[PDB]
Amino acid sequence: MSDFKVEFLRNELEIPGQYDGRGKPLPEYHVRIAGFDERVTVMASLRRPKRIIIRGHDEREHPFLVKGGEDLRQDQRVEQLFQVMNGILAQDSACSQRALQLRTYSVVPMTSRLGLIEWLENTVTLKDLLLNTMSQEEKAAYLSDPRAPPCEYKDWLTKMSGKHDVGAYMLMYKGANRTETVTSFRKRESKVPADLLKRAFVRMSTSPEAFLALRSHFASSHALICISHWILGIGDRHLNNFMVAMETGGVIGIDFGHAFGSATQFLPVPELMPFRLTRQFINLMLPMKETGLMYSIMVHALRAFRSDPGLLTNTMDVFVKNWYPRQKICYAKRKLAGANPAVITCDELLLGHEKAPAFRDYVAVARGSKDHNIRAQEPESGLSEETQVKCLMDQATDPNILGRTWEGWEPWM
Amino acid sequence: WDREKRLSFAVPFREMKPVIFLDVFLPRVTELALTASDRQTKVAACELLHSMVMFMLGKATQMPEGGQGAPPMYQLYKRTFPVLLRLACDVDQVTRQLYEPLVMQLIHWFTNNKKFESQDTVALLEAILDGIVDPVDSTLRDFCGRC
Amino acid sequence: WDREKRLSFAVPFREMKPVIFLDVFLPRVTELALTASDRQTKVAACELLHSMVMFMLGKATQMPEGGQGAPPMYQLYKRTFPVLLRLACDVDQVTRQLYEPLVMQLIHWFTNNKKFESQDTVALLEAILDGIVDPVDSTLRDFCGRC
Amino acid sequence: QGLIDENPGLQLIIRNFWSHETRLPSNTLDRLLALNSLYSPKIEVHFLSLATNFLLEMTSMSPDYPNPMFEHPLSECEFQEYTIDSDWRFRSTVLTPM
Ligand SMILES: Nc1ncnc2c1ncn2[C@@H]1O[C@H](COP(=O)(O)OP(=O)(O)O)[C@@H](O)[C@H]1O
């Protein structure tokens, strides 16, 4: 890598992944590899990727987040599905009025164990943004405060009969009444600062004329990404895994190390969160409320998706290569046709692990109490988009199912 | 145009000293400077922007932040330099005489030995180059060349 | 102590803004600071000199002159640093607590990346070394060593 | 003559007298011309200090007085505040290893 010099007897290498099929290439324009700088940096996460900086034909750089060890083919395919997804959104008039567009980024699977991912320039990590905005005083309230777990959580495991750090969740679901867990969750969420993103944006926008726009745009982006992910892109919504574009306010999906189903089949980290609608996002639309812009845009999006299902359903047959795919696609088509998201998540659990001593209590958690969770009332199948979305909302933001979620998947942000 | 608001001015009243952030003025002042119609407005705007860019330079040398990241006022420079450029070699003789010398002076400063290395000069050079490549502003080409 | 009078202060009255040259105070203020008898005078002088050296640093960073000869306030530094030093590790506990940290802070600043190369750091190092070699001020040796 | 009186209390009281607005004028030049009148032979040995104190304490109510002298710090370093003990004690007074 150090000594790349453009030379004859060597076919010039064009920058990986610079083709998008919206038209004939004009293949001369593409920037081609021209040596690349030092100062590779790591990204500080498990399976440490690093960040190459390729400079090419044009002296403008092109950071590409080299990453290995994973069968990135998964990421490639899922990104392609967002591509078709974004198409289907655009081709409608109702949705396009509001110019909804998921943001895709080039995924270029280089081999079985390597593939570049174009760094999105001028963007920051959602938890990076959050932590960045918080006052240096309260910064200690996440780094280390008397409630040593970010808010009391790891300690509260002990209070819920869970002794060790890993797997102790496997016990709490036994004696977790709808109250003490919920009350605890209220508390821990409360301690976390409020008006976070609001502060970030207020810092961002020039004049209050702009805050409303940027807020609408952030809300729309996060909303659309969330719903599209519920279609398929489930799982692993670590606050590292949502990027926010400092420049323009978009929320861009990031990692897909677990696609649909891959979230919850993987037992040691059981997950019952379909969306990410944790507190700071609610508090953003402060005077309004969830079921404000976000729920409406949910309704619109989901109504769009189901218009011609085959375009997206009968597109994720790329899993040609029992068969796990032959059934995860079935769950997908079930949800698109309309199933109580509680039901689909319950089925996901039922297939997920029937050998654990919790799947009774896991299923019970998923369903939610009939008294105070609007998900449990709906029929298992045959749902109208209004109902589908609303049920899914409650399933996402339910304090109970939220509160007992995995550490790391920081449910308070 | 900037995360945090530099260009802190202290409009010097008598009984007190309030602070007015000149950066919020700038994105609209510049648009006036390039494309205003009423020439009195345009020349006034140009003279304001000259003053204001001079203030940028000044507040730069009163470095509040010596690197360890993006240099301060770099983010401002990136979007004020193309303004300064294509506003030079505009076709108002007054503006031309006012800004062509300043662009020359800026180019001069940004290869003075002190901070010859800084990303600010990187940006200004990048601006001049994207000034050469300018597709439509035909006359901008020549001034960028001289630059 | 300096050909031309830096340390320009603008004692901020209301009806006007006169300029008072703090450098003329300094050669006598420092002598007070080291060797005053009445301890109220001495501590007051020490606190003045702390303020005044801080002002030196400040007026330095508002560089009016970027080299091309003797750096400005170098001539001042040469004769204020030995003062600052041997006035640290004096035997008044108040002065000690006031200036030992400042000398540490000065040493810290004068190997910050920005102007790590400057003759100012050369001078300060030369001062510390001539502080080691100090014949009579026995305790000065130790502080100079720590420095 | 009182402006030098032995008791610090009356010192402050008489000085505050002579610095109230209607006694010595409030702008600078009118002050500087006034202080020449604030002199007597006996107030001499202090008259310099007294003039300086008057002038500067009128500086004291000008708008730049609390405005920090230099706009920016010289780094990102965190700044704390510490008080100095100063409890009627000097440095060579407590024997070493107790
Ligand atoms: N598209 C992108 N552009 C820039 N940086 C990114 C991008 N995607 C991820 N990152 C960085 O990658 C880190 C996450 O790594 P990720 O891709 O999630 O793999 P893993 O699942 O192993 O963390 C984030 O902290 C973020 O800083």
Q: Tell me the chain C residues in contact with residue B114 when contact means C-beta distances shorter than 8 Å.
A: 66-67
CB distance A255 to ligand 1 below 6 Å: yes
The verdict on D52 touching C (C-beta cutoff 8 Å) is no
Helices assigned H by DSSP within chain C: 26-35, 39-61, 74-87, 93-109, 119-132, 138-146
Structure tokens, A318: 């790329």
Planar angle of CA B8, B13, B18, nearest 5 degrees: 35
Q: Which residue has the tokens 């304090």?
A: A399
**Cα A61 to Cα A6: distance, rounded to the nearest angstrom:** 16
| Cβ separation C113–B67 shorter than 8 A | yes
The closest residue, in CA terms, to atom 3 on ligand 1 is A119
DSSP A132-193: HHS-HHHHHHHHS-SSTTTTSHHHHHHHTT--SSSSTHHHHHHH--TTHHHHHHHHHHHHS-
| Partner residue opposite D63 with nearest CB, options B8, B14, B65 | B14
The verdict on B69 touching D (C-beta cutoff 8 Å) is no
Q: Tell me the chain D residues in contact with residue C14 when contact means C-beta distances shorter than 8 Å.
A: 27-28, 58, 61-63
Calculate how close chain C gets to B143, using CA atoms only, in Å.
30
3-state secondary structure of A372: coil
Structure tokens, D2: 């009182």
Q: Tell me the chain D residues in contact with residue C43 when contact means C-beta distances shorter than 8 Å.
A: 86
Phi, psi at C10, each rounded to 5°? -125, 55
Q: Quote helix, strand, coil % in chain A, to nearest 5.
A: 45, 10, 50
Are the C-beta atoms of residues A61 and A39 closer than 8 Å to each other?
no
Count Cα atoms within 13 angstroms, Cβ side, for A351: 18
Structure tokens, A145: 């405060």
Phi, psi at B20, each rounded to 5°? -125, 130
**Cα B113 to Cα C68: distance, rounded to the nearest angstrom:** 10
Residues 6+ apart with CB under 8 A from C64: C72
Neighbours of chain A (3+ CB pairs under 8 A): B
Calculate how close chain C gets to D72, using CA atoms only, in Å.
9
CA of C146 to the centre of ligand 1 (A): 46
**Cα C126 to Cα C140: distance, rounded to the nearest angstrom:** 15
Structure tokens, A266: 């993987």
Are the C-beta atoms of residues A17 and A108 closer than 8 Å to each other?
yes
Structure tokens, A329: 């696609």
Q: How many beta carbons lie within 10 A of that of residue B63, not counting itself?
A: 18
List residues bridging with A54 in a β-sheet: A36, A62
The closest residue, in CA terms, to atom 12 on ligand 1 is A43
Are the C-beta atoms of residues C124 and C77 closer than 8 Å to each other?
yes
Closest-CA residue of D relative to C43 is: D86
**Cα B72 to Cα A303: distance, rounded to the nearest angstrom:** 47
Residues 6+ apart with CB under 8 A from B140: B85, B86, B89, B131, B134
Number of H-type helices and E-type strands within chain A:
16, 11
Q: Tell me the chain C residues in contact with residue B62 when contact means C-beta distances shorter than 8 Å.
A: 61-62
CA of A239 to the centre of ligand 1 (A): 11
Phi, psi at A143, each rounded to 5°? -60, -55
Are the C-beta atoms of residues A191 and A147 closer than 8 Å to each other?
yes
CB distance A124 to ligand 1 below 6 Å: no
Q: Which residue has the tokens 């932040």?
A: B65
Q: A341-352 vs A359-367: helix axis angle to the nearest 10?
A: 170
Residue of B23, B25, B8 lying closest to B65 (CA atoms): B8
Burial class (CB in 10 A: 0-12, 13-18, 19+), B113: exposed
CB distance A387 to ligand 1 below 6 Å: no
Planar angle of CA A324, A327, A333, nearest 5 degrees: 140
Cβ-Cβ contacts under 8 Å between B and D: the total is 20
Residue of A207, D72, C55 lying closest to B10 (CA atoms): D72
| Partner residue opposite A203 with nearest CB, options B3, B24, B27 | B3
Closest-CA residue of C relative to B61 is: C62
Structure tokens, B107: 């180019």
List residues bridging with A211 in a β-sheet: none
**Cα A91 to Cα A83: distance, rounded to the nearest angstrom:** 13
For C57-66, the CB contacts below 8 A with 24+ separation are C57/C106, C57/C109, C57/D74, C58/D69, C58/D70, C59/C6, C59/C7, C59/C8, C60/C120, C61/B62, C61/B63, C61/D70, C61/D74, C62/B61, C62/B62, C62/D70, C63/B61, C66/B112, C66/B113, C66/B114
The verdict on D65 touching C (C-beta cutoff 8 Å) is yes
Structure tokens, C83: 């003062």
**Cα A213 to Cα A198: distance, rounded to the nearest angstrom:** 13
3-state secondary structure of A244: strand
Q: Quote helix, strand, coil % in chain B, to nearest 5.
A: 60, 5, 35
Are the C-beta atoms of residues C143 and C88 closer than 8 Å to each other?
yes
Which amino acid is residue C130, in one-letter code?
D
Neighbours of chain B (3+ CB pairs under 8 A): A, C, D
The closest residue, in CA terms, to atom 18 on ligand 1 is A255
DSSP code at position B20 = E
Phi, psi at B95, each rounded to 5°? -60, -40
List residues bridging with A124 in a β-sheet: A244
**Cα A31 to Cα A58: distance, rounded to the nearest angstrom:** 6
**Cα A129 to Cα A199: distance, rounded to the nearest angstrom:** 11
**Counting every residue, how long is chain B?**
147
Q: Tell me the chain D residues in contact with residue B17 when contact means C-beta distances shorter than 8 Å.
A: 63-64, 67
Calculate how close chain B gets to A101, using CA atoms only, in Å.
25
Strands A114-117 and A67-68 come out as antiparallel
DSSP B90-147: -S-HHHHHHHHHHHHHHHHHTTSSTTTTSHHHHHHHHHHHHHHT-SS-HHHHHHHHH-
3-state secondary structure of A42: strand
The closest residue, in CA terms, to atom 16 on ligand 1 is A255
The closest residue, in CA terms, to atom 25 on ligand 1 is A240
**Cα A387 to Cα C6: distance, rounded to the nearest angstrom:** 76
List residues bridging with A109 in a β-sheet: A115
The verdict on B64 touching D (C-beta cutoff 8 Å) is yes
3-state secondary structure of A50: strand
Which amino acid is residue B49, in one-letter code?
L
Are the C-beta atoms of residues B85 and B140 closer than 8 Å to each other?
yes
**Cα A71 to Cα A111: distance, rounded to the nearest angstrom:** 8
Write out the H or E segment, with its range, that includes residue A399: helix A399-403
Are the C-beta atoms of residues A82 and A253 closer than 8 Å to each other?
yes
Cβ-Cβ contacts under 8 Å between A and B: the total is 7
Q: How many beta carbons lie within 10 A of that of residue C2, not counting itself?
A: 17
Structure tokens, A155: 């300690």
Residue of A359, A400, A403 lying closest to A376 (CA atoms): A400
**Cα A199 to Cα A286: distance, rounded to the nearest angstrom:** 12
List residues bridging with C21 in a β-sheet: C8
Residues 81-140 of C with CB under 8 A from B: 112-114
Calculate how close chain B gets to C13, using CA atoms only, in Å.
11
Neighbours of chain C (3+ CB pairs under 8 A): B, D
Which amino acid is residue A44, in one-letter code?
A
Are the C-beta atoms of residues A245 and A204 closer than 8 Å to each other?
no
| Cβ separation D71–B15 shorter than 8 A | no
Q: Tell me the chain A residues in contact with residue B3 when contact means C-beta distances shorter than 8 Å.
A: 203-204, 246
Q: Quote helix, strand, coil % in chain D, to nearest 5.
A: 45, 0, 55
Burial class (CB in 10 A: 0-12, 13-18, 19+), C118: middle
Q: How far is CA A319 from CA A60, A77, A105, A330, C16, in A?
A: 37, 9, 21, 12, 81
Neighbours of chain D (3+ CB pairs under 8 A): B, C
Planar angle of CA A180, A183, A189, nearest 5 degrees: 135
Write out the H or E segment, with its range, that includes residue A41: strand A41-42
| Cβ separation B3–A207 shorter than 8 A | no
Contact call for B and C: 3+ CB–CB distances under 8 Å: yes
- The torsion region of residue A250 among left (phi > 0), alpha (psi -120 to 50) and beta comes to beta
Greatest CA span in chain D, whole angstroms?
61
Q: C138-146 vs C119-132: helix axis angle to the nearest 10?
A: 140
**Please, what sign has the CA dihedral across residues A138, A140, A146, A151?**
positive
Buried b (16+ CB within 10 A) or exposed e, C30-66: bebbbebeeeeebbebbebbbebbebbbbbbbebeee
| Cβ separation A207–B24 shorter than 8 A | yes
Method: cryo-EM
| Cβ separation B66–C114 shorter than 8 A | yes
Are the C-beta atoms of residues A130 and A197 closer than 8 Å to each other?
yes
| Partner residue opposite D84 with nearest CB, options C18, C91, C98 | C98
CB distance A46 to ligand 1 below 6 Å: yes
CA of A49 to the centre of ligand 1 (A): 8
Residue to substitute in A47, A254, A266 for testing ligand 1 pocket (most ligand atoms within 8 angstroms of CB): A254
CB distance A65 to ligand 1 below 6 Å: yes
DSSP code at position A339 = B
**Cα D43 to Cα A324: distance, rounded to the nearest angstrom:** 102
Side-by-side strand order, sheet with A33-36: A33-36, A53-56, A61-63
Are the C-beta atoms of residues C2 and C56 closer than 8 Å to each other?
no
The verdict on C66 touching B (C-beta cutoff 8 Å) is yes
Helices assigned H by DSSP within A208-316: 208-231, 279-284, 293-305
The closest residue, in CA terms, to atom 4 on ligand 1 is A119
Residue of A78, A33, A69 lying closest to A52 (CA atoms): A33
Are the C-beta atoms of residues A86 and A78 closer than 8 Å to each other?
no
